[PDB]
Amino acid sequence: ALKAPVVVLGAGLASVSFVAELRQAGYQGLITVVGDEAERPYDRPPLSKDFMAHGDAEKIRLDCKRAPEVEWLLGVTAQSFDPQAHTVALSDGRTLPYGTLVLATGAAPRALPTLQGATMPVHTLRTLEDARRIQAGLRPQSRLLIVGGGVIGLELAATARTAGVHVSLVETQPRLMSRAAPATLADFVARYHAAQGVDLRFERSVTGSVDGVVLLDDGTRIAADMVVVGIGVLANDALARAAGLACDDGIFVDAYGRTTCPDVYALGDVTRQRNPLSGRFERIETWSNAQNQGIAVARHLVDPTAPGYAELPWYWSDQGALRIQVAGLASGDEEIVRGEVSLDAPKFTLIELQKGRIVGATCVNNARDFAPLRRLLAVGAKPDRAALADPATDLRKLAAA
Amino acid sequence: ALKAPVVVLGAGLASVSFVAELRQAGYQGLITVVGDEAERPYDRPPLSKDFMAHGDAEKIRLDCKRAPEVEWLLGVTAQSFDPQAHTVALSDGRTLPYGTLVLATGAAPRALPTLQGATMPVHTLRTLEDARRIQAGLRPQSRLLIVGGGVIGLELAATARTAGVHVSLVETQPRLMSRAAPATLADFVARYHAAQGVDLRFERSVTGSVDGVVLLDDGTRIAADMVVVGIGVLANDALARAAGLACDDGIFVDAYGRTTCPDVYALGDVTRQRNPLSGRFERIETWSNAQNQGIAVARHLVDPTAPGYAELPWYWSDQGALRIQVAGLASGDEEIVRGEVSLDAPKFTLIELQKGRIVGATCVNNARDFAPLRRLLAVGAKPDRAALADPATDLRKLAAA
Ligand SMILES: Cc1cc2nc3c(=O)[nH]c(=O)nc-3n(C[C@H](O)[C@H](O)[C@H](O)COP(=O)(O)OP(=O)(O)OC[C@H]3O[C@@H](n4cnc5c(N)ncnc54)[C@H](O)[C@@H]3O)c2cc1C
Ligand SMILES: Cc1cc2nc3c(=O)[nH]c(=O)nc-3n(C[C@H](O)[C@H](O)[C@H](O)COP(=O)(O)OP(=O)(O)OC[C@H]3O[C@@H](n4cnc5c(N)ncnc54)[C@H](O)[C@@H]3O)c2cc1C
Secondary structure, three states, rough: OOOOOEEEEEOHHHHHHHHHHHHHOOOOOOEEEOOOOOOEEOOOHHHHHOOHOOOOHHHOOOOHHHHHOOOOEOOOOOEEEEOOOEEEEEEOOOOOOOOEEEEEEOEEEEEOHOOOOOOOOOOOOOOHHHHHHHHHHHHOOOEEEEOOOOOHHHHHHHHHEEEEEEEEEEEEOOOOOOOOOOOHHHHHHHHHHHOOOOOOOOOOOEEEEEEOHHHHHOEEEEEEEEEOOOEEEEOHHHHHHHOOOOOOOOOOOOOOOOOOOOOEEEEEHHHEEOOOOOEEHHHHHHHHHHHHHHHHHHHHHHHOOOOOOOOOOEEEEEEEEEEEEEEOOOOEEEEEEEEEEOOOOOOOEEEEEEEEEEEEEHHHHHOHHHHHHHHHHHHOOOHHHHHHHHHOOOOHHHOOO | OOOOEEEEOOOHHHHHHHHHHHHHHHOOEEEEEOOOOOOOEEEHHHHOOEEEEEEEEHOOOOOOOOOOEEEEOOOOEEEEEEOOEEEEEEEEOOOOOOOOEEEEOEEEEEEOOOOOOOOOEEEEEHHHHHHHHHHHHHHOOOOEEEEEOOOHHHHHHHHHOOOOOOOEEEEEOOOOOOOOOOHHHHHHHHHHHOOOOEEEOOOOEEEEOOEEEEEEOOOEEEEEOEEEOOOOEEOOOOOHOOOOOEOOOOOOOEEEEEEEEOEEEOHHHHEEOOOOOOOOOEHHHHHHHHHHHHHHHHHHHHHHOOOOOOOOOOEEEEEEOOEEEEEOOOOEEEEEEEEEEEOOOOOEEEEEEEOEEEEEEEEOOOHHHHHHHHHHOOOOOOOOOOHHHHHOHHHHHHHHE
């Protein structure tokens, strides 16, 4: 159960949601949060979206007032922990004792070795600092090269195009968002960005760079004023690895957030956990997971009577005129398409089925359907394939089941 | 003497210089610094200068590595202290014990009540946050109104003009930098800014504002997209006042940084101290004072054998093409002018005399002379009035004496 004092490593969304929930649940004991970034806790989603526009960090801070009497050690790095002695060594020379240790260290952007020593600016996008630097280079008429067709790269592509920047995007895979989205969506998104002026290149890899020019594996080249690398992230599990916990690009935890080390828990982007829909363990790198997992784990720690974490995964993406919401699995037995997939008036819904059962849903500029669909997904609904296809009200079908 | 542990309130230049000096001097005990700003300690001078151009805060951070093993509580506010119990109450619910308490809380910009409720943005310039907000409004062709003809307002005037902003400056006094500079300099500076396109208005006061228009006490009005108020600062001495120390818009301290409360010291912008040149007590709001006073006080705390703080005051200002350096008093018996005071090629030196004794010096785009002049000032030199006037080498005269 809960043993005081509580020490949380990392001051991101997972950590903030966890501590707030502890207090809300009733834990009145000591809570200390260690965050290496010298910044008032903030939200990351805005960084590749609205923030690139207003540059106002005060519009993206997280609400830490819901977590009364918590000491936040900002600008401090947890260098290591001793599971035997139950202590944490900090970069400022101090040591913190703990009853319960929570690792919410997130993940960090993977680097591109071929660009080691590029004569032009090469950035990754994870922190407020990264965002400020990138935002500064988004001048009109400049040439931006984005390596990686994931949601964050595409959101930045859309943002940059709006600022009058010329954007080129290189992806090793034959499609965009190859990991997190259904093929139908990836095809439409590619078409949308192409139509926006984005120079997309699939199945191309960066091999190197010479005098301000990026070289591709197909013997061609691309001159860029700035390069932004977004080819995925790696779990910040170094402390857990050194302390002997089970890790493989992420700390393994069960539904209670427990690691293989007693009194040590983990939450957020840094964890490999069971995907309830696929039954497999994976790292779920979403905003809702960081928040929901932090809450679920805090609740069970205060009350073992509470159930383990069981929320289904979902995320959203804002890419220019596209408001994308994706829940569950990207593929299944069959796919139902509601509405029309038109570049002109994009507004459709995709439903992924697995033997009559809803296992996934995508909504593009159709938020009204997302809520019900998530409910249907939650109960493993198996609705009428026909009713599902023809313009029925999901809110209604959802209500029934 | 020095009693552990040391607790410093405020994480500005004074605090950083003090703690670094403590460690350098040999104090190996505990040191805790409390700073209400959630920012890695940074320098303020760049904010109204270069920073407005590059917006890169990483180019202005202070070096805290010279102060090993210091715990920096950033984003935390010291709410009060108990000189009896020797404790400090923090905003996060924690309490810190202290052997020696140092107040380095600086000062805060004074507000303009007549602009309370202005329909347009009204900012003051003190922090990195203020700087980022102001920098965002510096768009070309916009109209900026600056209230206050002090160095910071003038530095911002120069900066804004360079960004193609239309600048209007209102000052209640008949001259610029009325407090810190010799009249000869203030006249030249006014002429320089006027020639740069700055709309200067002297002996004018702001009486109010209506629908995006600032009203002056002379029945006239000025439409402005943004207003920046820089009419001086007030010492952040609230904690000292509440604890019973002697204060009057600043904490009174002697040459050892001692306040009237045992075991409590104060440094920087927050202190009222003796001006060695005038013999009067005043608040010295300069960069060199924050650094030099912090050092002098740390030294004497570790070694009572060391002398009290005795540096003479000086500061600089970068206003467009003008590199201004001012040391000592702004006025005296007579003034010697070396070089030519031309708007075209500004490069002159002013020497303030008091019965044959050098009591002040101003250098405009003449840094070579500043060093020697400061040395002459340090020894209270009384050189030849003629030699001083005619092109002699100050380095040389300085060497002699
Ligand atoms: C630009 C961007 C846009 C995104 N947009 C979306 C979106 O639209 N929708 C969505 O669902 N998700 C989005 N995400 C993902 C979402 O931001 C993450 O899932 C979420 O931030 C993960 O939270 P976290 O608390 O686990 O970890 P993080 O936010 O990474 O925070 C972990 C913190 O711990 C710190 N830390 C690491 N090691 C140490 C140590 N040893 N000592 C002290 N501190 C340490 C880290 O530096 C960091 O500040 C986006 C992410 C980025 C970067
Ligand atoms: C825009 C600008 C430009 C300048 N340019 C020049 C220049 O060119 N040349 C020059 O000589 N001088 C210049 N100065 C003046 C110089 O910056 C100051 O003299 C110097 O910063 C004073 O240092 P300080 O450490 O005393 O206090 P400060 O820097 O004010 O820092 C005190 C710190 O304590 C914090 N604090 C206050 N109360 C509390 C509390 N209760 N708990 C915790 N923390 C608290 C404050 O918020 C602040 O961060 C400039 C100042 C500004 C604002």
